Design an enzyme around this catalytic site. Structure first.
Site, mmCIF file in Angstrom:
data_model
loop_
_atom_site.group_PDB
_atom_site.id
_atom_site.type_symbol
_atom_site.label_atom_id
_atom_site.label_comp_id
_atom_site.label_asym_id
_atom_site.label_seq_id
_atom_site.Cartn_x
_atom_site.Cartn_y
_atom_site.Cartn_z
ATOM 1 N N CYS B 106 11.547 65.811 68.023
ATOM 2 C CA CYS B 106 11.743 64.692 68.825
ATOM 3 C C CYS B 106 11.895 64.493 70.158
ATOM 4 C CB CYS B 106 12.586 63.497 67.892
ATOM 5 S SG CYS B 106 12.554 61.861 68.501
ATOM 6 N N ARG B 109 14.657 61.482 71.706
ATOM 7 C CA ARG B 109 16.066 61.373 71.493
ATOM 8 C C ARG B 109 17.074 60.705 72.426
ATOM 9 N NH1 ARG B 109 17.371 67.300 69.340
ATOM 10 N NH2 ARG B 109 15.128 67.574 70.108
ATOM 11 N N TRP B 278 9.024 53.822 68.960
ATOM 12 C CA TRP B 278 7.749 53.296 69.516
ATOM 13 C C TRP B 278 6.928 54.672 70.008
ATOM 14 C CZ3 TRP B 278 12.470 51.416 71.722
ATOM 15 C CH2 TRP B 278 13.071 52.414 72.643
ATOM 16 N N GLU B 283 0.524 60.857 71.631
ATOM 17 C CA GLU B 283 0.057 60.985 70.076
ATOM 18 C C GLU B 283 -1.188 60.261 69.817
ATOM 19 O OE1 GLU B 283 4.127 60.109 67.977
ATOM 20 O OE2 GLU B 283 4.754 59.204 69.937
HETATM 21 C C1 HEM Z 1 12.489 55.236 70.165
HETATM 22 C C2 HEM Z 1 11.296 55.891 70.385
HETATM 23 C C3 HEM Z 1 10.804 57.277 69.874
HETATM 24 C C4 HEM Z 1 9.855 58.196 70.370
HETATM 25 C C5 HEM Z 1 9.197 57.892 71.757
HETATM 26 C C6 HEM Z 1 9.716 59.243 69.832
HETATM 27 C C7 HEM Z 1 8.844 60.496 69.924
HETATM 28 C C8 HEM Z 1 8.307 61.517 69.159
HETATM 29 C C9 HEM Z 1 7.259 62.440 69.140
HETATM 30 C C10 HEM Z 1 6.296 62.167 70.137
HETATM 31 C C11 HEM Z 1 7.700 62.896 67.862
HETATM 32 C C12 HEM Z 1 6.491 64.075 67.521
HETATM 33 C C13 HEM Z 1 5.344 63.147 66.669
HETATM 34 C C14 HEM Z 1 4.213 63.808 66.421
HETATM 35 O O1 HEM Z 1 3.589 64.901 66.856
HETATM 36 O O2 HEM Z 1 4.073 64.050 65.131
HETATM 37 C C15 HEM Z 1 8.577 62.629 67.337
HETATM 38 C C16 HEM Z 1 8.891 63.510 66.042
HETATM 39 C C17 HEM Z 1 9.855 63.041 65.300
HETATM 40 N N1 HEM Z 1 10.808 62.018 65.589
HETATM 41 FE FE1 HEM Z 1 10.838 60.664 67.251
HETATM 42 N N2 HEM Z 1 10.618 59.250 68.823
HETATM 43 C C18 HEM Z 1 11.265 57.912 68.649
HETATM 44 C C19 HEM Z 1 11.950 57.503 67.644
HETATM 45 C C20 HEM Z 1 12.535 58.226 66.656
HETATM 46 C C21 HEM Z 1 13.447 57.643 65.580
HETATM 47 C C22 HEM Z 1 13.929 56.021 65.524
HETATM 48 C C23 HEM Z 1 13.610 58.477 64.418
HETATM 49 C C24 HEM Z 1 14.369 58.424 63.235
HETATM 50 C C25 HEM Z 1 15.410 57.471 63.198
HETATM 51 C C26 HEM Z 1 12.841 59.693 65.122
HETATM 52 C C27 HEM Z 1 12.935 60.953 64.461
HETATM 53 C C28 HEM Z 1 11.650 62.185 64.643
HETATM 54 C C29 HEM Z 1 11.613 63.060 63.512
HETATM 55 C C30 HEM Z 1 12.303 63.195 62.384
HETATM 56 C C31 HEM Z 1 10.277 63.654 64.255
HETATM 57 C C32 HEM Z 1 9.766 64.963 63.465
HETATM 58 C C33 HEM Z 1 8.660 64.292 62.837
HETATM 59 C C34 HEM Z 1 7.802 65.189 61.973
HETATM 60 O O3 HEM Z 1 8.201 66.246 61.498
HETATM 61 O O4 HEM Z 1 6.559 64.748 61.519
HETATM 62 N N3 HEM Z 1 12.356 59.398 66.415
HETATM 63 N N4 HEM Z 1 9.221 61.685 68.096
HETATM 64 C C1 LIG Z 2 2.781 68.625 57.223
HETATM 65 C C2 LIG Z 2 3.366 67.947 57.986
HETATM 66 C C3 LIG Z 2 4.729 68.592 58.394
HETATM 67 C C4 LIG Z 2 5.654 67.721 59.244
HETATM 68 N N1 LIG Z 2 6.827 67.952 59.591
HETATM 69 N N2 LIG Z 2 4.929 66.551 59.842
HETATM 70 C C5 LIG Z 2 3.720 65.960 59.583
HETATM 71 C C6 LIG Z 2 3.185 64.846 60.163
HETATM 72 C C7 LIG Z 2 2.368 65.014 61.231
HETATM 73 C C8 LIG Z 2 2.846 65.843 62.625
HETATM 74 N N3 LIG Z 2 2.063 65.332 63.633
HETATM 75 C C9 LIG Z 2 1.042 64.357 63.317
HETATM 76 C C10 LIG Z 2 1.586 63.971 61.834
HETATM 77 O O1 LIG Z 2 2.653 62.859 62.181
HETATM 78 C C11 LIG Z 2 2.000 61.586 62.577
HETATM 79 C C12 LIG Z 2 3.523 61.074 62.645
HETATM 80 N N4 LIG Z 2 3.929 60.860 63.897
HETATM 81 C C13 LIG Z 2 4.577 59.594 64.454
HETATM 82 C C14 LIG Z 2 5.556 60.073 65.233
HETATM 83 F F1 LIG Z 2 6.418 60.919 64.569
HETATM 84 C C15 LIG Z 2 6.792 58.887 65.759
HETATM 85 C C16 LIG Z 2 6.382 58.907 67.065
HETATM 86 C C17 LIG Z 2 7.325 57.755 67.848
HETATM 87 C C18 LIG Z 2 8.281 57.196 66.831
HETATM 88 C C19 LIG Z 2 8.538 57.549 65.647
HETATM 89 F F2 LIG Z 2 9.345 56.977 64.763
HETATM 90 C C20 LIG Z 2 7.714 58.584 65.119
HETATM 91 C C21 LIG Z 2 2.926 66.846 58.692
#
Ligand code: HEM
Ligand SMILES: Cc1cc(N)nc(C[C@@H]2CNC[C@@H]2OCCNC[C@H](F)c2cccc(F)c2)c1
Ligand code: HEM
Ligand SMILES: Cc1cc(N)nc(C[C@@H]2CNC[C@@H]2OCCNC[C@H](F)c2cccc(F)c2)c1
Ligand SMILES: C[C@H](O)[C@H](O)[C@H]1CNc2nc(N)[nH]c(=O)c2N1
Ligand SMILES: C[C@H](O)[C@H](O)[C@H]1CNc2nc(N)[nH]c(=O)c2N1
Ligand SMILES: [Zn+2]
EC number: 1.14.13.39
Lengths: 404, 402
Positions: B106, B109, B278, B283
């Site tokens: 993320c 953060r 947000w 993305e």
């Molecule tokens: C405040 C605005 C936020 C922004 C701009 C943001 C930004 C991002 C971005 C760009 C990613 C990668 C998404 C992807 O490629 O799938 C990400 C991943 C992630 N974020 Fe954030 N984030 C935000 C808030 C949060 C919040 C509120 C949480 C949880 C409380 C969080 C937890 C996570 C986690 C666990 C991932 C990894 C998700 C995955 O493995 O699919 N983020 N964040």
């Molecule tokens: C297989 C697998 C493993 C893993 N860890 N994760 C995935 C979701 C994929 C990651 N890449 C595209 C898709 O996840 C799309 C969801 N992303 C939204 C993003 F995480 C986001 C942005 C801003 C705020 C917020 F709270 C959340 C799939």
């Protein structure tokens, strides 16, 4: 599936297993506790086992594994080491080993070309002057008036209690960086130390943004000696843009030949501390890293101003727009000058083909995802969606710290 | 021991000492790095609980106090008697913020300390899950002035099945497989789309049809709920200078809300704990719209732009991708919906790294996910080395419930 890493492509859904990683005999920087994959810099018995492994590799590649010739070669290496502490490679073993070091290089996206490497054997070289001759010959052969040809020149290996052959420059062609009164740099900020070392060793400096550096060449146990490259040997490409007519007025240029000269080439425990190699550029290295890194030529803002972009706010995407036109200028200008170059789309497509080739030939391919994915347009290229396993195989190229 | 961490743009160096706090192994070994891969008794529970309660009392600077001792004894007593325990609401709040703080992938953060936590652990039915989810959406959306939130449903229990949200996000668009093997809508959601239909959903036929939720209470078949349209804020995409862009009919939803991840706190596991922040614009503009296996719009846009599509060296993909990202930012800005571009997001992430160095001695970060999918080296994070490791509390991927 088997107990080897599963490797997935997320665009196509396809899966392979890396079995080649089992062949790795050298540890990288990661542990189960922490990944350090993003870091840039991570005895008779020891030598003999590296040598045996390499000789086994060579006889496998010629399909003579276990043969009398294979066994006799092993015995010859062992006796050489027994009585001298070292050994020497046959001409064809050097050629095989050098192509294999390229094949093994996890950070190289250009590996589809690995089998097409001209290996110049310079293991007879006995002076800095002769290094210079060999280097000029390499540059002439490699440059080939713009139809670039991959090549490597191998100088003598490290030897017990005798100093190394070293090229002090990190590449054969680089531009000087001159520290200014006001603290700024004219030319390439990456080259400020080497530039100052050249002036110290008697080079009369220029005062331009794109002045080609001389070579500092060191033969065993001697101070390095200074050699200026004849300008007719160093092919350069003035940069222009296909539609933005003012771009040519910026006076930017880049040289044709990417030739890395500070890596150590390791083959069977033998260390070649001077073995410069060259290929051709992938355009992003010039257009994106060399010209736009904030710690390099840093030209994004200048170009965006010329394009009349709003540089006062991140969300106009002014940096993205300018970088794209600079990358397009590099491609257009090399194409115009008929100098071999490959764009990031075509390069990563060919690397995906290389991945498949290697899956069939050896059961995987060591690759460093952070380096293979290009520095603009990452996910627009197929390699961004491809999981990659990184590990060290030998023969290998390794970084060596500056000799100063 | 402690790895040296270098920034190659500025020459600055720190040492990561936080990684010594990791108690959970990742996928790498000294033989091979797997950092680019997307997917990875009572005594063990008790020590995770103790560690967590110790983290909690340390955060309110009451380590060793009476309340601290007595809370530890409560946890012990509950675990010894029943095999499990339960968090107090203030602990759940701290634990949720910490799992966000700890999430290596993320980039957002800098915001970790600002998180609205809805306690939904008194939920006993899919119906009630739906109400809680509708309230989260309304709160988080806030007419476009998005506010980070997480709703936490009841923890996993040894007896029984999990509470789960089947959808990977609370808002996603359907993908309908066509007779010609074409997909209409989002090819990422063909499977969930077909699941909704088989659970009785009447499908739309558009490119941007908002999916209903399949919500699952323990040991029950999932139930289908349609989101009231007025709760789902969307943004029509238009371009600041290209007039024909609006007529592509493109849109995206305001609220990114991940619903398939497991929240682990003190060894307890929350299998349904949807969270939302947000969007970072890349993305939507780069992945969702330009991935070849997603809406895949690059070629259509480049042709509208009249670019030469026949050759890679015209950089037509790069040009069209920039314009699509620009359209996303312009359109969200116009609709007054919170969004952050990749330059601003990565600059704030650098500040977060510096804050965390001072606060904790490091920050786990996954470089391949932190660096944006366009213009990587144009952002400061490209030049920043990163150390990746697993800290708890943590969010964990969990496989699809079917
Ligand atoms: C405040 C605005 C936020 C922004 C701009 C943001 C930004 C991002 C971005 C760009 C990613 C990668 C998404 C992807 O490629 O799938 C990400 C991943 C992630 N974020 Fe954030 N984030 C935000 C808030 C949060 C919040 C509120 C949480 C949880 C409380 C969080 C937890 C996570 C986690 C666990 C991932 C990894 C998700 C995955 O493995 O699919 N983020 N964040
Ligand atoms: C297989 C697998 C493993 C893993 N860890 N994760 C995935 C979701 C994929 C990651 N890449 C595209 C898709 O996840 C799309 C969801 N992303 C939204 C993003 F995480 C986001 C942005 C801003 C705020 C917020 F709270 C959340 C799939
Ligand atoms: C034929 C054309 C070639 C292309 C297009 C190419 C492409 C590239 C690129 C883009 C990089 C990343 C460079 C950087 O960011 O610093 C790289 C790295 C590398 N390549 Fe190649 N390559 C080519 C030929 C070669 C040859 C001939 C060799 C050696 C025989 C070689 C070995 C390496 C090595 C060792 C690295 C890592 C360099 C380092 O660690 O600084 N490549 N290649
Ligand atoms: C400290 C350190 C470690 C390391 N492994 N490497 C370096 C050289 C850096 C890497 N990134 C910028 C600069 O390397 C610039 C030189 N790269 C040219 C490239 F290797 C190339 C392209 C095409 C053909 C060919 F034969 C060679 C520094
Ligand atoms: C910190 C990070 O590892 C570093 O900036 C790397 C990222 N990827 C790279 N990739 C290539 N091809 N060349 C580089 O110099 C770098 N730099
Ligand atoms: C194979 C590779 O790890 C995969 O495509 C990753 C790379 N980086 C990413 N980065 C983010 N932010 N989101 C992603 O989905 C991915 N996908
Ligand atoms: Zn690793």
């Amino acid at each position: 599936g088997p107990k080897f890493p599963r490797v997935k492509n997320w665009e196509l859904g396809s899966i392979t297993y890396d079995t080649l990683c089992a062949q790795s005999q050298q540890d990288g920087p990661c542990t189960p506790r922490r990944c350090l994959g993003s870091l840039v810099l991570p005895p008779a018995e020891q030598l003999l086992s590296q040598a045996r492994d390499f000789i086994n590799q060579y006889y496998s590649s010629i399909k003579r594994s276990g043969s009398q010739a294979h066994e006799e070669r092993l015995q010859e290496v062992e006796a050489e080491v027994a009585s001298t502490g070292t050994y020497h490679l046959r001409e064809s073993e050097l050629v095989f080993g050098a192509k294999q070091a390229w094949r093994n290089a996890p950070r190289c996206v250009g590996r589809i070309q690995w089998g097409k490497l001209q290996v110049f054997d310079a293991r007879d070289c006995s002076s800095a002057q002769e290094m210079f001759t060999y280097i000029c010959n390499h540059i002439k052969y490699a440059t080939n008036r713009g139809n670039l040809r991959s090549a490597i020149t191998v100088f003598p290996q490290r030897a017990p209690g005798r100093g190394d052959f070293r090229i002090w420059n990190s590449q054969l062609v680089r531009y000087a960086g001159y520290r200014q009164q006001d603290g700024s740099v004219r030319g390439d900020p990456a080259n400020v130390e080497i530039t100052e070392l050249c002036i110290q060793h008697g080079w009369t400096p220029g005062n331009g943004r794109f002045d080609v550096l001389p070579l500092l060449l060191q033969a065993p146990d001697e101070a390095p000696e200074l050699f200026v490259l004849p300008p007719e040997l160093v092919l350069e490409v003035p940069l222009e843009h296909p539609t933005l007519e003012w771009f040519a007025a910026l006076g930017l240029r880049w040289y044709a030949l990417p030739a890395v000269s500070n890596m150590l080439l390791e083959i069977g425990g033998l260390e070649f501390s001077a073995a410069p190699f060259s290929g051709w550029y992938m355009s992003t290295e010039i257009g994106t890293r060399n010209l736009c890194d904030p710690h390099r030529y840093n030209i994004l803002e200048d170009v965006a101003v010329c394009m009349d972009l709003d540089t006062r706010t991140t969300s106009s995407l002014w940096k993205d727009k300018a970088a794209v036109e600079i990358n397009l200028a590099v491609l257009h200008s090399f194409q115009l000058a008929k100098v071999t170059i490959v764009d990031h789309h075509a390069a990563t497509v060919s690397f995906m083909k290389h991945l498949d080739n290697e899956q069939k030939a050896r059961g995987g391919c060591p690759a460093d995802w952070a380096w293979i994915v290009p520095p603009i347009s990452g996910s627009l290229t197929p390699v961004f969606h491809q999981e990659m396993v990184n590990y060290i195989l030998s023969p290998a190229f390794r970084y060596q710290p500056d000799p100063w």
